[PDB]
Structure formats: structure tokens, C-alpha cells
RNA sequence: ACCCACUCGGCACCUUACGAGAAAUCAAAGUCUUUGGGUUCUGGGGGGAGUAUGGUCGCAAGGCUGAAACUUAAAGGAAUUGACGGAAGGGCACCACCAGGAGUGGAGCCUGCGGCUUAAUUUGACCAACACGGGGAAACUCACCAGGUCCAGACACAAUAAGGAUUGACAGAUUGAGAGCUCUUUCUUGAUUUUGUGGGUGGUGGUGCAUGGCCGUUCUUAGUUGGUGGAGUGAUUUGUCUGCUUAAUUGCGAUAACGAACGAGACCUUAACCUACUAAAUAGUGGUGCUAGCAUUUGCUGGUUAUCCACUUCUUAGAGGGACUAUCGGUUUCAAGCCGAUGGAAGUUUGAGGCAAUAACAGGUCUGUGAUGCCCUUAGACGUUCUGGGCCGCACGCGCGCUACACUGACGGAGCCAGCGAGUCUAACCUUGGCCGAGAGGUCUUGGUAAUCUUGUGAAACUCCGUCGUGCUGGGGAUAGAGCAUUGUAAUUAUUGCUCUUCAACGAGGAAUUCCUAGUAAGCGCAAGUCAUCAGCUUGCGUUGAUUACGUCCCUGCCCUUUGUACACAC
């Protein structure tokens, strides 16, 4: 038995590098002149999600990020 | 990859497509023994091959290595390489020069004209920016700029001054099978300088049938 | 003439070697390292080469004389061991034959190897491969191919990095795919991780000609060795054998051998004997014993330790006993044994195995192993995985098997007797009985972790009765068509089984060749390994059960003695 090279009919596949956000945490909370802060992304209604899980925005729904549920803005 | 005959360095490769053959192990010693022979001297007129590739699609062998040994390996592949290299229309490649002819303004007019005299040509019509001393690189099939040291002096005046240098090869296919083609006849001079058959053997005698 | 006894000379010969020799050998080849009787010739490693040339002699053929260049580290002698002989003798073996049996080869089919073919049709093996790798492969297996995935990058170092190294991500697209693989819009986690450098790690990757181990073969033959002693300078040899005998280097006996050892044997296991010991509801038997039925002069059955008792002959299994060739006759040289008869369960090593000597083979196996060196690779992975395909493809040859080619048969009905197994609760195994169902199967339950339930495995040949009636026929089931079921997610390149439709070659087989001498081959079936399903395979078990011969070395091999050898890689 003599082996052979594995043919590549397609170019190489590149593993995705994570989108390293730079201080995007500063863009999830908004403070007023008195410093009163308010969340900008909604929270997950499932108990095991977190008080700052900050459901990711999308085109026509709301994806959690951790609990991997689906939310609708107008429900 | 096995070897690079001649010398184990020449641009000749032992490519195997043999993917279901067992006895490649004990023949790689003597397959490479005669692969460098057919590339040291050639079939047509007997010199070094260059950019010649051997693509062993398949090999048929014996059970034991006795009549599959050196006595029956060197000759049999000395007719197998002579087959493929002749089945792909063997051609001629000729060395050229790295000339840089120091010259006046219009000596190029002499140079550019005397360069294309014997199938030679020009790479580029470059020049020195700082002076009207132009410098030209050219293709010359080593045949042959015997110093034209008079010809460029017959056009320009009092500064003509040719000096040249040497470079790598260059290839053009002229179909050397018949004694009519231009490179199919230069081999004739080298042929009788060797003292063997005038006619080039075709691939029919070096290649068999089913 | 002969006989006897001498003596000289000659051809020789027999023993021993005191002696010699390298030894074979020698009475001269002795009186030679204790070297000198007289004398002539020749040789100085092998080839080149008795050659070139010169010379001489010859009618010539050629003779006599006779180099060198170059080339080589051996050529050669004599014996030893082995190997081999189309050398001789002698033993052994149904892996050889005689007398026979059954076949295989011929038809079909299963299956293996080659070959052709493909993407792969993975592969190793060539008496001692070829129903072998437990290899009856859908996925896996699996080692190949077209693909998609994970890092299973230990450890150390450097770099990146909480102003975040990073991983995951629902939806679309891509995508075989409900892989966030990666893209499309941006959330989760948090020094777990990412890049490189060294080090690994993994690999059914290669190397069995690097190996261990294992296994097979030589070799199922009877062979192997050392101690002391004898011969030789020695390697070696005798012992270990002329003969007879044995399956046997088994013994008797002959002996420069003696006493030994391993193998064989001895050993053990299985099978048959034991009315004797020991027993028993997981084994059976007897009881006009318990109860009941049957038919009625009384025999056959059902629940009988749980409805009792008595026992171990059948069954089981412990301990043993039994044959050791026992007795009688013959044979041989008394003998080792052998042959026949009697008695005996057993008289073939009682049967059959297991283990089985030194030495090896480049026998095979790294593809059994987290046995294993080296080498190859290690992130676009040859590692690991998931989908699908392949291992089975098909002008062809060979091997091993199954089915058959028929009347000592087939078909149908009926009678109807085993053993060796195995089986699930560390779970879907073995399933009884009843039901559905032509079948295939499905079904509710029962029993079994097992001498108890499958199971008296009620198996098949066989037996009886009937149909067929010489028609390749009702033999044969090949290929193919349609449907029904189970296992598996998945049956397509038919899993398999079942139903029906088709009855192809095949009228018994050429060379050749296989195996086999008594519970034997062969006919017949069952169990088990395989296994989710698949048994034409195979191990075992049994059922029926021959012929022929108790031998020979002609054929084939093996071994021994002698012999020959220029071989030792050993024809």
C-alpha cells in the first residue's frame, strides 16, 4: 500500500477571528447629566439569563447572546 | 520525488502516478540509476536535458527482483524515457547572453539592427539616464555576435564601444525531426561532430503497442 | 611332477606402524630439526602460458628450448560436518502405493486468489497461500475514495492579552446536513484560550529482511546432547551400532565404550467396564402405596419427597478397582518381541487427543496488543471523528465448498429415537403455553442467571403406505418477476426468510489429483463461533454406517548406512 496526497478542490478554509470590540461596554449603558444610568439592550426574561445579558439587536427580532432564545420587540 | 538526474540536480523529475504498485521499494535504487543516464546524454543528438519531466503513470514488474534487477532495469527504462520525451515533440533550448553594450546615442540603431541577425532579438531597449551611453540586453542564441565592432562604428561616429556578457538559456520549438527546420539542421553539425546516425530516430522504435 | 625345509633373484601381497607424513597413506614415501651414503633432473602462488618471439630438429603435423607485459589473493592437497546425486543398499508414511471406498476436476451455485475494471474495488498469504487473517464487511468494522467536522497542540518558553487571549452563538446565506465551518447584521463567556519556538502526543502509517511474543513448517518423524574413556595434530568421531525388533535412538544383542539426560514413552484428559463404596425433587425406579382414568381377571397412564416410603441398576460424579498383552501353543539364537487361540468390558501405544526435544526457516504476523526501535507525518492532519460510496464491481484461469445430474429417486401422508451447547435483571437473552397469521412473522403470558424452563432440543436420513413410471421427467433449483415479514435509523448494488411464477446446464464426468483401514470413510441432522439480521464456512456433537488390506517401497516424499562431490548462499 502506497498512499497519496489529499486533493484540495477548494481553497483553504480560514477559522473566524473574533470581532474584538474596543470598549463596546461603554455603549450598552447611557447616563444623564445627573449620572442616572439606564440599560440600552433589553434583558432576557428567562431566569437563567442575567440582569445585564443584553439581548443582541438584529433586523426583526432580539437574540439573547447567552440563552439563545428569540424575542420580538412588539411581541 | 526520487532524484534529479543528471548528477541528482538537473531539472529532471521522477514523477510516479503509481498508486497501487508494491515493488517500488526495491526498484527505486535502479530506476534512478538509469534515469540520470538518458538525461546526461539525449536521444536526438546526445547532451543534457533541461526542464524534462518523467511522469511514471504505471509500472509493471515481476515477482522476484532477479530479472527485475539492474540487468533488466537500466536498458528497459533507457527505452521508456526515450519514449515519452519523444512523444511530447522534443525541442531545442538555446542559451542566451546578458549583454550590456556600451554605446553612443544611435549605436543602438546599429545594435538594435545587428542584434536580430541570426534569430536573436532584444529583451529591452533600456539606457543609462545620466549619459547618452545606452545599454541593451538581448537574446543571442550563442550564435553569434562576433564583435560587430565595425558595424556600429559605420553609423554613429567617434564613441562606439561594444562590450557584452552572458546569461541563462532560452527555448523555441523548431520541430527537429526533419533535416529541414532551422534548429532541425543545426543539430546536424553537432551530429556528425559526434559520429552517429544522421537521421533522428522517431518514437515508434522507442515506444511499443498493446 | 609333487610334498616338506631352506637359499638367491623377481613381480607382488597381508598386519602393525615402532618410524614418517598435512593426511590419505607408506615396509618404503622409514634410518630427515637427534637435519650430511653417492649422484642427475626438476619446482618456487595462480593466471598470462607452454603463449609470443628467437633458435634448432621435422616433408608437414609439430617437437625441444622458452619469456614478458599485465592481472589476481588466492589457486591447490588430504581429510571432517552438512547439503545434494537422473548413485547403491535399508527403513518409514493411505499428507505414497497394492486391494478398494468416497470423491474433486466435468453442470450450476457459494466463496477465495489472480486478472480486467473502477474513486477505492484497502489489504497480507503463493506441499508450508487461495470458507485463511476467526475476513458470513449496509453504517461501524475499515485500513480506500468524494466530502464535512475536533484539537484529543500534553509540558516549557516567547508573543498577544481584563482599554479583554479568547470560545460559543439563535436567524439567513453557504453548506450532503438542524457543522456559527465560514460569511451576513453583534451578543455570551473570560486568561480556560490564540501565534510562533523547542518537546511531545496520536497514527489498521512503512519496515516481520530491525524485533519480542505467538503460530506454522521441517516434525508426528524419532531425533538431540554433554561427562568420562578410546582414535585422530585437528576439525570431528565412537558412544548414538552389523543384525533382529518396535509406532518409536522401542528394546534384545553385538561392543572402545561406560554410565547418563531431554524427546518418544512415561504424564494427564476424554470414552467404554464395575448390579461394588457414597449419595440424591435439578436423575430415575418399585410399591392390586396415595388419587383418578382407561380396557376389564390386573395391564397401560396422569399429581405423586411438595401426596408418602425404599433404593441407586439405568443418570450424575468423587474415590478407587480393572489389562499388564493375562493364560495355552508356535516362532526365533535362548531373546527383545511377533502370531494364533482361550478368557476377558476393554488384547491396534485399548480408543482419541493434549503437552511435546536441539537446531533453525530471513515461513507469517508492526493490520491483535497502551508489545516495540528507527523512519514518515502531526493542524488544509496519514491522528480523531460524521455523511455517502467500496471491499460484492466481471471478457477470463485456478482453488475450497454446497446443490444436484435420480427409482437404493422424488413427492405426499404417517411412525417417529440423541448428544455436545447456549440462554436476560452489570437487561431485553433463551422463550413454553394460548391467540392472530398460508407463510413469513406479530401477539398476551409462563419458565429459566440455568441436570429443573426452552428441552425427551419429537432433527434428518430411516421405516410404512400411496402418487410418479425412463420423459433432462414430478430430478435439478440457476437466473429472473411480483408481493408479505422481521433486525437495523437505513435492506438500494436483491440482508435474510417467506408466497407464487421459470425450470437453464447437468444422462455420473478426459488428463490429473485429494482423503481414508472400524464405530472408520461416506450419507444425515443438530448445536456453538460469527451475530442487530446474515452459515453454503467452521469447530464439536452425535444418527445411519461400508468396501478392501493387515502389506510394500514400484510412484511421491522423509530418514539411515555406504558412496561421489570442484557445492556450503549448500543443486
Curated annotation (Swiss-Prot), chain B:
The modification Phosphothreonine is found at residues 81, 131. The modification Diphthamide is found at residue 67. There is a cross-link at residue 209 (Glycyl lysine isopeptide (Lys-Gly) (interchain with G-Cter in ubiquitin)). (Microbial infection) Diphthamide can be ADP-ribosylated by diphtheria toxin and by Pseudomonas exotoxin A, thus abolishing its function. Changing residue 95 to S: Causes resistance to sordarin. Changing residue 142 to F: Causes resistance to sordarin. It is found in: Cytoplasm. Present with 160782 molecules/cell in log phase SD medium. Belongs to the TRAFAC class translation factor GTPase superfamily. Classic translation factor GTPase family. EF-G/EF-2 subfamily. Binds to 80S ribosomes. Actively translating ribosomes show mutually exclusive binding of eIF5a (HYP2 or ANB1) and EFT1/eEF2. Interacts with the 40S ribosomal subunit protein RPL9A; the interaction is direct. Interacts with the 60S ribosomal subunit proteins RPL12A; the interaction is direct. Interacts with RPS23A; the interaction is direct. Interacts with 18S rRNA; the interaction is direct. Interacts with 25S rRNA; the interaction is direct. Interacts with RPL0. Interacts with STM1; promoting ribosome inactivation. Catalyzes the GTP-dependent ribosomal translocation step during translation elongation. During this step, the ribosome changes from the pre-translocational (PRE) to the post-translocational (POST) state as the newly formed A-site-bound peptidyl-tRNA and P-site-bound deacylated tRNA move to the P and E sites, respectively. Catalyzes the coordinated movement of the two tRNA molecules, the mRNA and conformational changes in the ribosome. This is Elongation factor 2. It comes from Saccharomyces cerevisiae (strain ATCC 204508 / S288c). The chain holds residues 633 to 842 of 842 of the full protein.
